[PDB]
Amino acid sequence: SHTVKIYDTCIGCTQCVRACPTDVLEMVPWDGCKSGQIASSPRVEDCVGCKRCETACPTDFLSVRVYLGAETTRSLGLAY
Amino acid sequence: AWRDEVVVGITAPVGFFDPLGLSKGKDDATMAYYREAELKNGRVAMAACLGWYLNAGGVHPAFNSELSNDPLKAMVELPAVGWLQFVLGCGAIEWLGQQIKERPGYVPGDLLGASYWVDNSDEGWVMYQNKELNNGRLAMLAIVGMVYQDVFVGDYGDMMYKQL
Amino acid sequence: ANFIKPYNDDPFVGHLATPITSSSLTRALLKNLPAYRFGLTPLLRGLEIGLAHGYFLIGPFAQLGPLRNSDIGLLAGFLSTIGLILILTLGLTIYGAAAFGQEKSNGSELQTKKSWDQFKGGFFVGACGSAGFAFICLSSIPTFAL
Amino acid sequence: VDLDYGMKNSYVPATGGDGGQGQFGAQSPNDWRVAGTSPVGETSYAGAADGGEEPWFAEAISTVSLDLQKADETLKAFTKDAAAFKIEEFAAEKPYGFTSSDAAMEELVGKLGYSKFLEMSTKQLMKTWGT
Amino acid sequence: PFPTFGGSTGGWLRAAEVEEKYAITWTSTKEQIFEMPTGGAAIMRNGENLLYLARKEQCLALSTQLRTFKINDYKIYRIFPSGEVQYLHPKDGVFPEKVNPGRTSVNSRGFSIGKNPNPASIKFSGITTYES
Amino acid sequence: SKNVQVFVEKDAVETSFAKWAQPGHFSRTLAKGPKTTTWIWNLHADAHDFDSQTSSLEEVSRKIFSAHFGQLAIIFLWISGMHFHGAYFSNYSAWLTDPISIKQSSQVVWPIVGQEILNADVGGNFQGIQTTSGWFQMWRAEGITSEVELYWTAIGGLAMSAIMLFAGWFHYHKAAPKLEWFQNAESMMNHHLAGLLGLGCLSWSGHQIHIALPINKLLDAGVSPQEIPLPHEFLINRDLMAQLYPSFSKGLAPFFGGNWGEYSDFLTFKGGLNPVTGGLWLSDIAHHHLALSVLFIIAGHMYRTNWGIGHNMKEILEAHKGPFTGEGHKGLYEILTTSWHAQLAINLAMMGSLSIIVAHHMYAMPPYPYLATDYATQLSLFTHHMWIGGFCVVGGAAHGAIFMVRDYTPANNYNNLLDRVLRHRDAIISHLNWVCIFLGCHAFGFYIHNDTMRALGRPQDMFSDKAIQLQPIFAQWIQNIHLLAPGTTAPNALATTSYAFGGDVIEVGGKIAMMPIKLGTADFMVHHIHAFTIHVTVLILLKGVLYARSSKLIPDKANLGFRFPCDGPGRGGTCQSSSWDHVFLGLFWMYNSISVVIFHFSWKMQSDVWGTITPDGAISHITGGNFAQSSITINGWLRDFLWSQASQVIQSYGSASSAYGLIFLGAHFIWAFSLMFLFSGRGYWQELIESIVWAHNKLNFAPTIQPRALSITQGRAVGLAHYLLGGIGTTWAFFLARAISIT
């Protein structure tokens, strides 16, 4: 459904993965930052488009960007 | 045996009341018919009582209050079309009731199917049921008394508590 | 005593067993309605439903329509009812096409194309005929006086 | 367990503006567009639940559930690869008197259950398997 | 192993029976009252507990509450109509907020957000700048 | 020891001006300092939210008690000013002598910039603004007579204001009560229901019986105000009272004995309105308060305190449970004794509801001398109290929601009434939605149908009293019941409680005070519209309370708070999903509802009640009875009401009513101004600000407190505020200007 992309400016603060309401983001090993960790979006099929993740990023400009797109039952948050 | 299981209807003033023993040899089915009849006759009586009281009081705000305050006179004044609807409507409900009766687990008198949620184990349930029966029994006698007063004595209002 | 319980004893389904939802009265009435009754064929189900809905629809038009005070008011009311029935029938036809498709197999399941078509047909006949019956009845109203 | 059951759906990702099937598939294999209620003694939604004497509330009769025993299997199957990676690393770090990966797994999971096994560092594992 | 609840009109609907359904499980050490996302209060059982919901978010919301009770053994599954089950969370046994060796990066662009291509350049291509 | 005791902490807070110089001290976040303009706005928006400023109920409670003293001080100063202005800047004396001709005025403008035109020739050799609050009538009823007395009550007010302010300081800085003291509901109710209300009524009855009644009788008879004996004289010389009311001769002997009948001279159940003044008989009012006093005092002895006898509210609440309601009212006591928001909800709703009742009962049964004939005052009071009520009711709902989000605890509420309500919320909201649609389609449809029919030249097909008619049969019936009550169901009464139900036309000064108000098809149509408006308001507000903590869309709304902008652009859009936003939308519907009600009052009265009657029986209503056949269509309201009755404001220039014209225009402007906040978004504004800041920077200067755009929530608030001010303001001027002329 929606598209979430992570950029090299990430600092591995883990704040984004701790804010997702649907477990779409994970922290994976990396060497480009001091923390030695980067964020990934393995399960974008469950993204609802809340953008809470973006609100949590501390980088000058979001290192995590959510681009809204095709809509499915899951993305539209339909319990019915 | 109905006598060995029945719990509702047996109260304090007199306990089990069958002076003429009209239920000694009756089977469960006959006894069930009796209880259903008792409840129905009583419930209808309670309603009739309220109706009579309202009309007698003068609160009959229908047909521009044209009909008489005397309940028995009013019935004569009512068009037949009104009566036909009444009988037919009640008849319809009677049919539905028969359907409910056939369904397994029917407790004589229960049309709401309260058996689904509550049983006679609950004392509150049995007590409230007793209140319906007791008030119904009283109402039956009352409606019969009132008619006598209106048809013979000549009055259709309270002749007991009216004297403040 | 609790008169409200989880439906079907499932504490997590979105429904509750209230006296209104599950009482002998409600169960009995719904079981014997033409829509859910057992044994009725698709055509007969539609017929009963149509007969019922057509009879009560002539009233509103006949007594409150544009030509209510005209001598031909009842006739006009009948025509209006027939028009409404046609609109409703179009809806039924269209619904069936979209919901069921084009070729069916199960059969005798109100929820199939063939069964739905039969159901629709019954509704039309029953509704129009019922409206006609009301026309005949309303032509001369009995006073039931002796 | 068909780990691809969800992925095997009718969804076809679009060119641009779609994340894709992701990790567990984007949509259910089954179509939600089923029919409505049916008369007594009839069924509508394919493998639907018979409404008995209350067909009107048939949709409230559950037929989809989770078996606790079966639940264990799905946990193991979907986490098989992770377990493999974990044990592999443990093996790489010169295990004391090592035997076979599988054997080690059984021994290491006999203790520390399975969930605990998945959440333990190779170092902790080696300490645990010192014996 | 269902927790003690009296029912609500906010439970699941047909989609749970024809499209897809979810389930969360956890273990408790005491019987305590929690608030369910559907609406209302329920009492968990002393031991295993299972509850069904219609959305993953509803399940994960409850997990947050569970963490307050110091319960961290929760597991979430998706049950399809045919009976197939998918284990979803914690996917690898380790919570996502904790780096677990063995997880690969996905959807990562190796440049600052400002280095994406210009829209005009990719015209009549079908791709987007952020996917280019 | 004793269950009810007084616990107070001495010297709790030091009095100093240090915190005054540290704006934002109350908040941890704001205290750090200003970095953007948002800090400024937040300072003002979080000033009185004590719950967020402290985590201890005792502290929050202490602040509330003291803050209340502050409001009381302000109220006292307000009342004081009014009496003073009525002593030094009014024509009360002249009006007192000729109430029918002289017009009430208590405000005078300085002769600056032609504003003097606003000083009208009210009468009595006096020029000023015609006030419409009804002070003169009240003072006459009390028996003021002089302006010296008004001065003294003003001084008393100032003194009282000071005492309250001291009390606030004292009970917060020097003697602050502890939480245990506050949590004594039974005692509080006993005291407030027997002391505040009971003793209050009794005291008032004393004034009315010994001072007001006698003086007013003399005034009505014709005695010149100067010739009426001073109040103290009546209190001392019993003989004087005996002359007026021939029972004081017997003294209090009849009272101690059981012969209360002898006091029938001043305690009566006459009913109806005094023919001379057009107001309720004071004798009846005196008996009213006396009777109420006894009732309240008795009621104040129902709850247990320290002597065993009495009721414990907890027990009463817990006992009331039934088969369909689980644990029943268990848990409510704790909620209402541990949550200020919950208490405010109930109290605020009831207070607002009372105001609406006051509005209805105070016009049908005019309570003051020479009030009914003053159409301006009547209209002003009805509308004023109708509004105050609406706001308060919506406020109750708001605080109810704040409770659910901040104080509700699942543990303390298991299977209680509250829990069960939140468990079938879908059913409740679904049904109410339908009810609203049903009512709205049918009620408003009637009007649209009629408009179409009249325009198509088919008047015989309209829902009118001359065609298809929809008569309010039930209401017509109740009216008859109330009309025939005197002498039957109310044997000892002498007249109808209100002439609205039926009776004769009471006229004072050639003007109609009250007349039977009849109900027809038009009334049916409007009443049902009122139902629709109120129902929709409840839907929005109730939905907010029930879905405050969670929803299918946002399962964790609680954590987000009571006032969050949204959750995001996802789920298809989650804008305005907070409970605060529900209150935001509810206020708009409350505005609509009240507006229609006040308009109904204005047109109905000016058409079927108010007017003049000749010496013989000829009644000429102000508008001429147009309500029946014109209020049945929307065009009628636009033409026969708004367009026609607005001729006064639009043509007010060059007159003392010019102010209303200017305000009418100004209000329209503010209403429109608000629409820019309600339709736009923060994004556009923030970007515009960026460009503007560029300019300032280009000139080497820019604020360190970086300029930022108003928050999403604030934007909505600013819009609603201006919208309400503009709309209400417009009607305010429209009504007042029209009323001045009709009077």
Ligand code: CLA
């Ligand atoms: C004149 C402007 C206007 C109108 C007509 C409406 C209409 C409505 N609003 Mg609304 N609203 C408005 C302005 C308006 N709003 C503004 C400015 C705001 C901002 C505060 C809101 C905020 C708002 C909220 C927050 C809520 C509403 C709700 C409602 C609905 C009430 C239910 C009802 O009566 O249905 C009847 C609707 C009618 C328009 C009646 C007239 C229609 C005809 C006369 C009846 C017959 C027509 C028939 C159905 C079809 C004819 C066929 C042919 C014409 C094609 C209704 C759709 C409530 C809602 O949805 O709950 C139900 C609700 O919660 N409104």
Ligand code: CLA
């Ligand atoms: C419709 C009438 C009716 C019917 C069918 C019943 C039936 C029953 N009653 Mg009952 N009852 C009635 C009216 C009725 N009652 C009235 C009006 C009173 C108030 C006095 C009572 C007071 C009463 C008590 C206190 C008790 C019962 C009990 C019972 C049950 C066991 C006793 C029995 O078998 O009676 C058999 C009765 C019948 C088969 C029908 C009654 C016989 C008819 C009415 C003959 C008419 C006689 C009467 C004098 C007619 C004149 C009336 C008026 C003109 C004076 C049985 C189901 C007992 C119970 O519930 O135990 C489980 C019990 O303890 N009844």
Ligand code: CLA
């Ligand atoms: C509800 C309270 C209230 C209100 C609204 C009014 C309103 C009015 N009064 Mg009035 N009055 C009141 C109470 C009130 N009064 C009371 C209680 C008394 C008894 C003391 C009086 C005594 C009184 C007299 C004697 C007179 C008025 C006059 C007036 C009119 C001119 C007001 C004025 O001075 O403008 C001009 C305003 C000023 C000169 C004040 C200067 C503005 C100050 C400096 C701004 C405030 C500074 C700010 C708070 C700094 C903050 C510091 C921090 C510590 C808080 C005006 C209509 C006058 C009038 O009608 O004349 C025809 C007049 O002569 N009043």
Ligand code: CLA
């Ligand atoms: C008994 C009355 C009463 C009391 C004690 C409270 C108390 C409270 N309310 Mg509440 N409320 C009330 C009535 C009341 N309310 C009513 C009637 C409504 C419906 C409109 C509301 C709606 C409401 C909302 C929607 C919210 C509160 C909030 C709050 C809390 C913080 C208030 C705050 O931010 O202070 C600061 C106060 C202000 C900034 C108000 C200043 C006045 C503004 C600027 C409007 C002035 C209009 C003015 C009269 C127009 C003059 C025109 C002229 C210029 C020409 C506090 C517990 C807030 C909260 O967070 O609760 C926890 C919150 O979100 N209340």
Ligand SMILES: CC1=C(/C=C/C(C)=C/C=C/C(C)=C/C=C/C=C(C)/C=C/C=C(C)/C=C/C2=C(C)CCCC2(C)C)C(C)(C)CCC1
């Ligand atoms: C309120 C209520 C109720 C209900 C009621 C109702 C709702 C009714 C309805 C009714 C109806 C609604 C009915 C209907 C009827 C119909 C009919 C009766 C029809 C008929 C028809 C016919 C008979 C035929 C026709 C035809 C055809 C078929 C075709 C051809 C031609 C012809 C004509 C032959 C009751 C009482 C139960 C109870 C209480 C509640």
Ligand SMILES: CC1=C(/C=C/C(C)=C/C=C/C(C)=C/C=C/C=C(C)/C=C/C=C(C)/C=C/C2=C(C)CCCC2(C)C)C(C)(C)CCC1
């Ligand atoms: C207007 C106003 C005001 C007011 C004033 C006043 C209100 C005055 C008065 C005062 C007073 C003038 C008071 C009085 C009181 C009295 C009382 C409250 C009485 C009581 C009684 C009693 C207590 C009794 C007892 C007893 C009994 C019961 C019987 C036996 C014997 C004995 C003794 C035991 C002010 C200025 C504030 C402010 C402004 C406004």
